[PDB]
């Protein structure tokens, strides 16, 4: 409710700044991805819309890690922009909440 | 199972198996097109020359490593990497290390006109002729999907319209605008 | 049509294919040379 948007909705934009202070950043490490993923509404995406998705062999450009469950990179394809990349323990959260 | 792999930031530009590799066919079919590449991307390549087997992890571990940590550094600072690499001859020769290069594959579409070239390079050649039809027809026999870019252009100009306009597709995939 | 049937068509496509295929492997040798 009232008290729980005081804090909520302030990391949402603090999470957003930090998204927007990174494409200028120059790429760190590259990875290659084995398995595909798309984002979902109850991952607990730091900024509700902004994430990215990769199917099975694709390719991020991860520019800076936001959080231990989120990095920050670009898919390499024409246009794409940055995006809030799931970590491998964040891939390790995201399976073992479907079997509890 | 690791579902991410640290792999460079541009990927190598490499070129293997249009024939074997190690002979006056297929490595002068190869330098023809290491030129095209060296002035109508320069400035923006790094172009090396690969000694050691690069698909072991002969050499040892620290003189491969050292070579591919090289491939590490030349991704740091955004620009495209190009390996004469001299052993390469199959797809999944390169599918074990963490480079992942780019598979550009040179066909030729008419094996017929492979031992035709083969007597065209005198006699020294023409005492190696089945021996380079083996993975002539190998590569041949690899699906071309697992590969990433094909020529199979006679001609100088419509092998390197493909061979310029397929990488500055990857180069403004992998750059974007400001 | 006498001819085409029989087997004329391959003569023509062919060394049509082959001389065109001949002159990108000289164009493969002939920059190798020179650069």
């Known amino acids: 409710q009232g008290p729980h948007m005081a804090l909520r909705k302030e990391a949402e934009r603090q999470a957003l700044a930090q998204l927007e202070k990174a494409k200028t950043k ?59 990349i799931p970590s491998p323990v964040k891939l390790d959260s995201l399976r073992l909440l479907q079997e509890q | 199972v690791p579902p991410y792999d640290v792999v460079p930031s541009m990927r190598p530009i490499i070129l293997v198996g249009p024939s074997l590799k190690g002979y006056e066919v297929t490595d002068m079919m190869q330098k023809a097109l290491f030129d095209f590449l060296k002035h109508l991307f320069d400035g923006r390549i790094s172009i090396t020359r690969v000694t050691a087997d690069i698909s072991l992890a002969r050499s040892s571990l620290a003189e491969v490593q050292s070579e591919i940590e090289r491939i590490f550094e030349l991704a740091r600072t955004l620009q495209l990497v190009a390996l004469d690499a001299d052993t390469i001859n199959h797809p999944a020769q390169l599918s074990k290390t963490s480079l992942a290069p780019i598979i ?26 089945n021996v380079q039809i083996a993975a002539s027809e190998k590569l041949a026999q690899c699906p071309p999907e697992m590969f990433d870019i094909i020529l199979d252009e006679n001609q100088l100009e419509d092998a390197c319209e493909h061979l310029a306009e397929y990488l500055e597709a990857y180069w403004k995939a992998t750059h974007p605008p400001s | 049509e006498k001819a085409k049937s029989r087997g004329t068509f391959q003569k023509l496509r062919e060394k049509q294919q082959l001389e065109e295929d001949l002159r990108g492997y000289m164009s493969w040798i002939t920059q190798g040379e020179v650069m």
């Open chain 1, 26 to 84: 120059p790429v760190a490490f590259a990875v290659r991805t084995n398995v595909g993923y798309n984002p979902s509404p109850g991952d607990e995406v730091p900024v509700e819309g902004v994430a990215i998705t990769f199917e099975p062999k694709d390719f991020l450009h991860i520019k800076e890690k936001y959080n231990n469950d989120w990095w920050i990179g670009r898919l390499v394809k024409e246009g794409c922009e940055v995006g809030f």
């Open chain 2, 104 to 129: 550009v594959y040179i066909k030729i579409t008419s094996p017929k006109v492979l031992q035709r070239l083969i007597k065209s390079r005198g006699k020294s050649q023409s005492k190696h002729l």
